[PDB]
Design a binder for this molecule. Structure first.
Ligand SMILES: [Mg+2]
Ligand SMILES: [Mg+2]
Ligand SMILES: [Zn+2]
Lengths: 51, 108, 152, 148, 166, 289, 132, 297
C-alpha cells in the first residue's frame, strides 16, 4: 500500500548537443536567402519578350 | 447485518440509472442583458457581480488608506469621485474618495 | 414537528447563533455590503432592520444605546449608526436591507447572497430590472389600459 | 442445442427433381503433400480413385494443388455459393472416398436444425380450415337473439 | 494503457464526389487521468449525451459538481479544435454525439481501521471521452402513440401460422 | 512465456478469423481466386445441365459488349495491340435476342395451351413475370452463369445477368433444336411458378371491373354482392365473407377484415376461378412424351 | 425547449398594478353578479319529503371559543366561517353510479394566475372566480 | 388578366419567384468576401468574414452562439432593419435586436407585418373556390391598437353574410397548422417591372405595387414568401413562423361607405414565444381585439 506513478516526461526538444560534444550537426541547407531578388514593378506589364 | 448474495450488474444498473438518480435538465438559463455572459434567473450575473466587487475592492482600499488605522469609521456620509469630476455643492460635508480612473459607464 | 417555528438553528446553540448574527451585523454596519450564505443573511437581515429602528429612536435614549452597545462589537459603529445610518432613513419606514442571490460559493457549494443598506456610496449591484414598457405585451396592455380609461 | 444454433426450413435449392436433376456440386479443390506422412491416404487417393471419381459425375471440376502442407484439405463448392472445407488429415483411402462421395451427394444448404421435415407448397386442396367451415347458415343470415 | 481515442482524429477520408451528401465533420477529444470517480463523472456524461454544444455548456456552467468544470474545459477546447483544425465553419453548429467515462489507473493506500486492522483505500481516477458531430442536434425519438401500438398488434396477429403441421 | 508453437499458431489463426469477420473484404470474382480454369468450367457447365452445347457458341454467349469495350479501353490506356482475338469476340447480343424471342414465344405457347381460358393480357403479364429481371437473375445466379460471365463491376448488375442468361438460352437454341430448348426453359422457368398465386404475378388494380367485363363477355348478367358470414362488426378485428351471386347462384366467396376488402377478395376469387387458375388446378405435367 | 413562465414575468413596471386592479375588479364584479339567484332563472324548488338529503357547504375554520348554557356548563365551539361558497356543477342520477345524484360545491376564492388551464376554462364558462 | 385555376396561379407565381431568385444568385460570379463588423453590446469588436450575397445575418449569428440564433429577431445593418434571412451586400456593421430589448418598436412592427401576412395566407386558401378572394393590403396600424388587420374583397355573392365563431376557430386552427410547421420567411428585393409581371391579375395588388415603387427612385419593392404564398409588404419580417405562439383571428368588420363594393377587414391578435401571456391576460387581449381598429391617417 505504498506505490506511486511513473513517467515524468517533457515534450519540447532543446540544445543538448552543444552542452558538450565533439560532433556537430551536419546541415544540408541554410536558414533564409542571401539578398532577395526584387522583381521589376511592371513584370506583368512587360510580360512580353522585351521593351 | 451482512449481504447474503452479490448484487449483479443487472440489478445495479436498474438501481443506479433510473430517472430519480439522473441529473435533471434545468432551463432557468438565459443571456444577461448587459455583457451576454449567461446568468441564471433569480441570480445575479457572476460577470457583472465580479465587475462590481473589483471596483468595490479598490474603493475599500482607498478608504482604508484614508482612515489610517482601525476604529476610525467617520460620522459623515462618504462619496467617491473619479478623475475630473469636481465635488458637487450637495456633497459638501461628505467624505471625498478619489482613486484614479474614468468613471465607468454603469456607476452614475 | 416545527409548525410555526421561526428562527433557524445556526451555530452550536442559541448563544452561538446570536454571536454569529452579531458578527455578520457588525460587518454590515462597517462595510455596508456583505456576502455570506443565504440562511445567515436572512436571519441577520431580520435583525438589521430593527437595529435601524433602535438607531432611529434617538441618541439620548438609554435603551437604544444599550442595544447598540450590545449588537455593535467595534464601538465606533455606534456614532456611525446614530449619526449617519439613522439620519439617512429619516423619511423611510421599512424599505432597506436589499438582499439578492449571488451564484454559489466555490468550495462547498453553498447558497450565497448579498445584503446592503440603501444609500450606500459603493457602486450599485447589477439589479434585475422589470421589463420595459415598449415591448409587445406591455404595448398591448397599454392599449387596453388606455381603452378602458377612455371608456370610463 | 437447438436454442443456441440457427435453424432453417426444409427446402430444395432450385426445385431439383421437378424438371431435370442437376448435380449441386461445382468443385473439389485438393491440397496434398509430396513428402509428409499426414497426406498418405490422400496421396493414394490421388493415385487410384480421383480419376474414376472425375469420370463418374462429370459436373464437378477437380483440382489437385500438390502443395507443402501439414494438414491436407478438400474444399467443396456448391452451386448456391457455399464453400465447405474439410480436412483429410491422416485418413484411409476408404475414408477419403466416403468423404468425397458424401460431399458429392449433398447440396449446399446449411447443416443446421432442419425444422419440420416436409415442405408442402400447397398444403390444402379441399380448402383450409376457418371457423365457418362445418357451420350451417340460417335464413337471411340472422344472428342469435335477432328480431328481423 | 491504450490510447486510440486520440488517434481517431487522424483518419483522412477520400475526396467526395460532387453527386454526394456533405459527410458532417467528426471530432474526438478526451482528457486522461482526471482525479474524479468514474460513476460521478458518468452521471454528467449521461446528462450531456444528446444535447447541442451551447446547451451543454449552459447546463454545465450551472451544475455544481467537480466534474462540470472539467467537462466544460474539454468541450470548449474541442469546439476550438473543431473550428480551427478539422474545418468546421460555425462554432455553434456542433452536437455531442458520444459522451462517456472510463476507469483510469488507480493507486492504493491503507485506511487504518480501529484495532490492528486495515482496509485498502483506493485513489480513484477516470477519463472523459467526447465526440462532436457538426449539424443540428437530432430530434428526440417521439413516444409511440396508440396508432403505432395498434398497428404493431395487428401485424403480430397477421404474422401467426398453424404450427406443428404442414 | 510458455514454451511451444502450436497454441500460438492456433491463436494466430483465430485472430485472423476474428479480424476477417470484423472487416470483411469486398468480394472478388471466382475468376480471380486461385482454383479456376475457364475451359473446364464451361465444359462442366455444359455437362451438369445434361446438355450438349457447341462450346464456341457458349464461349460466344458468355462475353459481353461492356466487357469488350472495357478490355479495349484497358489495352488502349496501356497501348498494347490486342487486335488479334478481340476483333473476333462477337458479343452476345444476337444470341440474347434469339434467346429472348424463342423463350417468349415458347412460354407463350405453353401458357396458352395449359390455360386456354386465361386472357392475352394475363399471359403477357405472366411471360413478363417469368422472363422478368428478378427471377431470371435468381435462376442465373443459382445455376452459376454469374461466375462465368465476363463483365466489369463484379456483382454483375441484373440487366447484364438477364442478358447473358437469355444468351445461353440462345446458344442452346443454336446447338440443339427447338424441342431441347423448350424442355430447358420448361424445367428452369416454369417451375418458378410453383407455389405462387395468380395475382402475385399479374398484379391487377381493379379486380371488380375486370370481373364485370369478363362476365360481360360470357353473357352472365352482373354479379351482385351479398353478405354471407360475419363475426363481430363493432370490434377492431372483424371477419367478413362476401359472396358474389349471378342470377341467385354463387360464383365465389372471399374473406376480409372489412366489407370492401372482402368484396375485392371475392372479386379476386371469381377472377381466378374464371381463368382456370385455382390452387386446385392440375400441377404441371413434367414428363416426356 | 420552452422555458417556464409565470403571470408577471414579461409585464412592465406600470402594468402590474393595473393587471392586479383589473382582475380584482373583475372577480369582485363576478362575485357580486351572482348575489340574487332567485331573480335569475331558478331551478324548481320542492318541499321536504322524509327520504331527502340536501347539500352542504365548505367553511374555513377560524378558531375556538368557550360558550355557556343556562344550566352553567361550559362548552367549546369552533367558529367555521362560510367565506365564498358556490354550487359549481350538477351530475344526475344515471350519470355517476345509478344510486344518488351529486352536486359539486366550491370553496374560498383564489387567484386565476395559479390554476390549470382547464379549471380556468371551467370557471370562465361558469362565470365565477376559481375556488380552492 | 385571364382565366386561371387558383393552383396554377400559385405555380406560375412561385416559379417566377424562383427564377428571379436564381438570377439574383447567379448574377454574382464567385465568392466575394465582406467584413461585417459587430457594433453591438455583448461581444464587441468581433468581425466576421462573410460571403457576399450568400451569407445571411443568421449565418453571422451562428458563428457566435446558439442564443444569438434563438433570441435575435431583426438585424440592424448600419441604420436600417434587415430581416434575418436576407443576404448582405456591402461591408457593413451589424447589431441584433431582441423582443425584450430597451426600444423594441421596430421589431414590433416587423412582427405584426409577419402576423398580418400569415393571416392573409390563411384567409386566401380557406374559402370556396367558386367564390373569388382578392387580397387588397395590410395597412400599417400601430401596435398600441389591439389587433393586426388585413383587407380583403369577398365575392359579389357574399355582400350579406358574416362568419360565426366556428369559421373563425377554423381560421385559427389553420393558422396554427401554418405555425406548427416551422417555415422560413424568405425575402427577395425585385424591380417594379418583374414584380408587376408576377401578379398581373389583382388590380389592388397592382396599385399597391405602384404606390410602393413610386416612393423609391430605383422602383424596387419588397416581396416575401412563406412556402407557396407570395405577398407585398413594406419593411422587413421575422425569420421563422414558429416564433408566434398564441395566435387568434378575432373578428371581421365591413367598411362600406367609401366605396361601392364591400371590403372586409379581418382582425386578430398574436404574441411571440418569448413574450407569451397567462391565459387570463390573453383572454383580456383577445376580448379587446374584436373592436374595430381604424388607424390609417
Ligand atoms: Mg450545524
Ligand atoms: Mg495499535
Ligand atoms: Zn452579465
Amino acid at each position: 500500500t505504498e506505490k506511486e506513478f511513473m513517467q515524468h516526461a517533457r515534450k519540447a526538444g532543446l540544445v543538448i548537443p552543444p552542452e558538450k560534444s565533439d560532433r556537430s550537426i551536419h546541415l544540408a541547407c541554410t536558414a533564409g536567402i542571401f539578398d532577395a531578388y526584387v522583381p521589376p514593378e511592371g513584370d506583368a506589364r512587360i510580360s512580353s519578350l522585351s521593351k | 447485518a451482512a449481504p447474503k448474495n452479490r448484487r449483479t450488474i443487472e440489478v445495479n444498473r436498474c438501481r443506479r440509472r433510473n430517472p430519480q438518480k439522473l441529473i435533471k435538465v434545468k432551463n432557468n438559463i438565459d443571456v444577461c442583458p448587459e455583457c451576454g455572459h449567461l446568468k441564471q434567473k433569480h441570480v445575479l450575473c457572476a460577470y457583472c457581480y465580479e465587475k462590481v466587487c473589483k471596483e468595490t475592492a479598490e474603493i475599500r482600499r482607498q478608504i482604508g488608506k484614508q482612515e489610517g488605522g482601525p476604529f476610525k469609521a467617520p460620522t459623515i456620509e462618504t462619496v467617491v469621485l473619479y478623475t475630473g469630476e469636481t465635488p458637487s455643492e450637495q456633497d459638501q460635508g461628505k467624505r471625498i474618495i478619489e482613486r484614479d480612473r474614468k468613471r465607468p459607464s454603469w456607476f452614475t | 414537528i416545527s409548525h410555526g417555528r421561526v428562527f433557524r438553528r445556526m451555530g452550536l446553540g442559541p448563544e452561538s447563533r446570536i454571536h454569529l448574527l452579531r458578527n455578520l451585523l457588525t460587518g454590515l454596519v462597517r462595510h455596508e455590503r456583505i456576502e455570506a450564505p443565504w440562511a445567515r443573511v436572512d436571519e441577520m437581515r431580520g435583525y438589521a432592520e430593527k437595529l435601524i429602528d433602535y438607531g432611529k429612536l434617538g441618541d439620548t435614549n438609554e435603551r437604544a444605546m444599550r442595544m447598540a452597545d450590545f449588537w455593535l462589537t467595534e464601538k465606533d459603529l455606534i456614532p456611525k449608526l446614530f449619526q449617519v445610518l439613522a439620519p439617512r432613513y429619516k423619511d423611510q419606514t421599512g424599505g432597506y436591507t436589499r438582499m439578492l442571490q449571488i451564484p454559489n460559493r466555490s468550495l462547498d457549494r453553498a447558497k450565497m447572497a448579498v445584503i446592503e443598506y440603501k444609500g450606500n456610496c459603493l457602486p450599485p449591484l447589477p439589479l434585475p430590472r422589470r421589463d420595459s414598457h415598449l415591448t409587445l405585451l406591455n404595448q398591448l396592455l397599454q392599449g387596453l389600459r388606455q381603452d378602458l380609461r377612455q371608456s370610463q | 442445442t437447438a436454442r443456441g444454433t440457427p435453424s432453417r426450413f426444409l427446402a430444395s435449392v432450385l426445385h431439383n427433381g421437378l424438371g431435370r436433376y442437376v448435380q449441386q456440386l461445382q468443385r473439389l479443390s485438393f491440397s496434398v503433400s509430396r513428402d509428409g506422412a499426414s497426406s498418405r491416404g490422400a496421396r493414394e487417393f490421388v493415385e487410384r480413385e480421383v480419376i474414376d471419381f472425375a469420370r463418374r459425375n462429370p459436373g464437378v471440376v477437380i483440382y489437385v494443388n500438390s502443395r507443402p502442407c501439414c494438414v491436407p484439405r478438400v474444399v467443396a463448392e456448391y452451386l448456391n455459393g457455399a464453400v465447405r472445407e474439410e480436412s483429410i488429415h491422416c485418413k484411409s483411402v476408404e475414408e477419403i472416398s466416403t468423404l468425397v462421395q458424401k460431399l458429392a451427394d449433398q447440396s449446399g444448404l446449411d447443416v443446421i436444425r432442419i425444422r419440420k421435415p416436409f415442405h408442402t407448397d400447397n398444403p390444402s386442396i379441399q380448402g383450409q380450415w376457418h371457423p365457418f367451415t362445418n357451420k350451417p347458415t340460417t335464413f337471411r343470415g340472422l344472428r342469435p337473439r335477432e328480431v328481423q | 494503457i491504450s490510447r486510440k481515442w486520440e488517434k481517431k482524429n487522424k483518419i483522412v477520408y477520400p475526396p467526395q464526389l460532387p453527386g454526394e451528401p456533405r459527410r458532417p465533420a467528426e471530432i474526438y477529444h478526451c482528457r486522461r487521468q482526471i482525479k474524479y470517480s468514474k460513476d460521478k463523472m458518468w452521471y454528467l456524461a449521461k446528462l450531456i449525451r444528446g444535447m447541442s454544444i451551447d446547451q451543454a455548456l449552459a447546463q454545465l456552467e450551472f451544475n455544481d459538481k467537480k466534474g462540470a468544470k472539467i467537462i466544460k474545459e474539454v468541450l470548449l477546447e474541442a469546439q476550438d479544435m473543431a473550428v480551427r483544425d478539422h474545418n468546421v465553419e460555425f462554432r455553434s453548429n456542433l452536437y455531442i454525439a458520444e459522451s462517456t467515462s472510463g476507469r483510469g489507473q488507480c493507486l492504493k493506500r491503507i485506511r487504518y481501521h480501529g484495532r490492528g486492522r486495515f482496509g485498502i483505500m483506493e485513489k480513484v481516477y477516470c477519463h472523459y471521452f467526447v465526440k462532436l458531430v457538426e449539424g443540428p442536434p437530432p430530434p428526440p425519438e417521439p413516444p409511440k402513440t396508440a396508432v403505432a401500438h395498434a398497428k404493431e398488434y395487428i401485424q403480430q396477429l397477421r404474422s401467426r401460422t398453424i404450427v406443428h403441421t404442414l | 512465456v510458455k514454451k511451444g508453437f502450436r497454441a500460438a499458431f492456433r491463436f494466430q489463426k483465430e485472430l485472423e478469423r476474428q479480424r476477417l469477420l470484423r472487416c470483411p473484404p469486398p468480394p472478388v470474382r471466382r475468376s480471380e481466386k486461385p482454383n479456376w480454369d475457364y475451359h473446364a468450367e464451361i465444359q462442366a457447365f455444359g455437362h451438369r445441365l445434361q446438355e450438349n452445347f457447341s462450346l464456341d457458341l457458349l464461349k460466344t454467349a458468355f462475353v459481353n459488349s461492356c466487357y469488350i469495350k472495357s478490355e479495349e479501353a484497358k489495352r488502349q490506356q496501356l497501348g498494347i495491340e490486342k487486335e488479334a482475338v478481340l476483333l473476333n469476340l462477337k458479343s452476345n447480343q444476337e444470341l440474347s435476342e434469339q434467346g429472348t424471342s424463342f423463350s417468349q414465344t415458347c412460354l407463350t405457347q405453353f401458357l396458352e395451351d395449359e390455360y386456354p381460358d386465361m386472357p392475352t393480357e394475363g399471359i403477357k403479364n405472366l411471360v413478363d413475370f417469368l422472363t422478368g429481371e428478378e427471377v431470371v437473375c435468381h435462376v442465373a445466379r443459382n445455376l452459376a452463369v454469374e461466375q462465368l460471365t465476363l463483365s466489369e463491376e463484379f456483382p454483375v448488375p441484373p440487366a447484364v445477368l438477364q442478358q447473358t442468361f437469355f444468351a445461353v438460352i440462345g446458344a442452346l437454341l443454336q446447338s440443339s433444336g427447338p424441342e431441347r430448348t423448350a424442355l430447358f426453359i420448361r424445367d428452369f422457368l416454369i417451375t418458378q411458378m410453383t407455389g405462387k398465386e395468380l395475382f402475385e404475378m399479374w398484379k391487377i388494380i381493379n379486380p371488380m371491373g375486370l370481373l364485370v367485363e369478363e362476365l360481360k363477355k360470357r353473357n352472365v348478367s352482373a354479379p351482385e354482392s351479398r353478405l354471407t358470414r360475419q363475426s363481430g362488426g363493432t370490434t377492431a378485428l372483424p371477419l367478413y365473407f362476401v359472396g358474389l351471386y349471378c342470377d341467385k347462384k354463387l360464383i365465389a366467396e372471399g374473406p376480409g377484415e372489412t366489407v370492401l376488402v372482402a368484396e375485392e377478395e371475392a372479386a379476386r376469387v371469381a377472377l381466378r376461378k374464371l381463368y382456370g387458375f385455382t390452387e386446385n388446378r392440375r400441377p404441371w405435367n413434367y414428363s416426356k412424351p | 425547449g420552452k422555458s417556464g413562465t409565470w403571470w408577471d414575468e414579461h409585464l412592465s413596471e406600470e402594468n402590474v398594478p393595473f393587471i392586479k386592479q383589473l382582475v380584482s375588479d373583475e372577480d369582485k364584479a363576478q362575485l357580486a353578479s351572482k348575489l340574487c339567484p332567485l331573480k335569475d332563472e331558478p331551478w324548481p324548488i320542492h318541499p321536504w319529503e322524509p327520504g331527502s338529503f340536501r347539500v352542504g357547504l365548505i367553511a374555513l375554520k377560524l378558531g375556538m371559543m368557550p360558550l355557556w348554557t343556562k344550566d352553567g356548563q361550559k362548552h367549546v365551539v369552533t367558529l367555521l366561517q362560510v367565506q365564498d361558497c358556490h354550487v359549481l356543477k350538477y351530475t344526475s342520477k344515471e350519470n355517476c353510479n345509478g344510486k344518488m345524484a351529486t352536486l359539486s360545491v366550491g370553496g374560498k376564492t383564489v387567484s386565476r394566475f395559479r390554476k390549470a388551464t382547464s379549471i380556468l376554462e371551467f370557471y370562465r364558462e361558469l362565470g365565477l372566480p376559481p375556488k380552492q | 388578366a385571364s382565366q386561371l385555376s387558383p393552383t396554377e396561379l400559385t405555380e406560375m407565381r412561385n416559379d417566377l419567384f424562383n427564377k428571379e431568385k436564381a438570377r439574383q444568385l447567379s448574377l454574382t460570379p464567385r465568392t466575394e468576401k465582406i467584413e461585417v463588423k459587430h457594433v453591438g453590446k455583448t461581444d464587441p469588436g468581433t468581425v466576421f468574414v462573410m460571403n457576399k450575397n450568400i451569407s445571411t445575418p443568421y449565418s453571422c449569428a451562428m458563428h457566435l452562439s446558439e442564443w444569438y440564433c434563438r433570441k435575435s429577431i431583426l438585424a440592424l445593418v448600419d441604420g436600417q432593419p434587415w430581416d434575418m434571412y436576407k443576404p448582405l451586400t456591402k461591408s457593413c456593421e451589424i447589431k441584433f435586436l431582441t423582443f425584450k430589448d430597451c426600444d423594441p418598436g421596430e421589431v414590433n412592427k416587423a412582427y405584426w407585418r409577419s402576423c398580418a401576412m400569415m393571416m392573409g395566407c390563411v384567409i386566401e386558401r380557406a374559402f370556396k373556390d367558386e367564390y373569388m378572394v382578392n387580397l387588397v393590403r395590410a395597412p400599417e396600424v400601430p401596435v398600441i391598437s389591439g389587433a393586426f388587420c388585413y383587407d380583403v374583397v369577398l365575392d359579389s355573392k357574399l355582400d350579406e353574410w358574416m362568419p360565426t365563431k366556428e369559421n373563425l376557430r377554423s381560421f385559427t386552427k389553420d393558422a396554427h397548422a401554418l405555425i406548427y410547421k416551422d417555415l422560413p420567411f424568405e425575402t427577395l428585393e425585385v424591380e417594379a417591372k418583374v414584380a408587376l409581371e408576377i401578379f398581373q391579375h389583382s388590380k389592388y395588388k397592382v396599385d399597391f405595387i405602384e404606390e410602393k415603387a413610386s416612393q423609391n427612385p430605383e422602383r424596387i419593392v419588397k416581396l416575401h414568401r412563406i412556402g407557396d404564398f407570395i405577398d407585398v409588404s413594406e419593411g422587413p419580417l421575422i425569420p421563422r413562423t414558429s416564433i408566434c405562439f398564441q395566435y387568434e383571428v378575432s373578428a371581421v368588420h365591413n367598411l362600406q361607405p367609401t366605396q361601392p363594393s364591400l371590403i372586409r377587414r379581418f382582425q386578430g391578435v398574436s404574441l411571440p414565444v418569448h413574450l407569451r401571456a397567462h391565459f387570463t391576460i390573453w383572454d383580456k387581449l383577445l376580448e379587446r381585439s374584436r373592436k374595430m381598429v381604424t388607424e390609417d391617417q
